[PDB]
Amino acid sequence: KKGVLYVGRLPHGFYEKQMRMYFSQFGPVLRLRMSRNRKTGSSKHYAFIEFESLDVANVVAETMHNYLLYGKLLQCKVIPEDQVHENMFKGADVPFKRIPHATIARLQHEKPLSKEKADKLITRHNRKLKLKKRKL
């Protein structure tokens, strides 16, 4: 069936599209799930990618395992089928396109508020200041 694989110590710059192409050269990948941060989207260099064929994954793993690429040993270990899950297959072969959250907060701050909106924005700020005074 599908060749679930989860490599380790992936060298920095090993793009998921580039990694998929490199993996597909040895054998096609059914799933290409890549690690990333929850907000930053920064990859954890975990190549949790499922190959098309289980045997193809084993052959690919044998060559890839312990390969000194870009100064790092490619710790390629085939992920067990039991270890592989639907949630593991979830998000596979997809890009973690992150919107400019910093700009969004800046844009929201730059977003004008009307007099009623400013009063709504203030809300219980005086009460919060009173609450802060009460806490102090």
Partner: peptide, 23 residues
């Protein structure tokens, strides 16, 4: 002929550097 993985990563880093150099 087969292509080594590190060959493509060189191209990837060149693309990132070129975008920075052209920025």
């Amino acid at each position: 002929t087969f292509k080594r993985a590190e060959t493509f990563i060189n191209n990837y880093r060149q693309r990132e550097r070129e975008r920075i150099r052209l920025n």
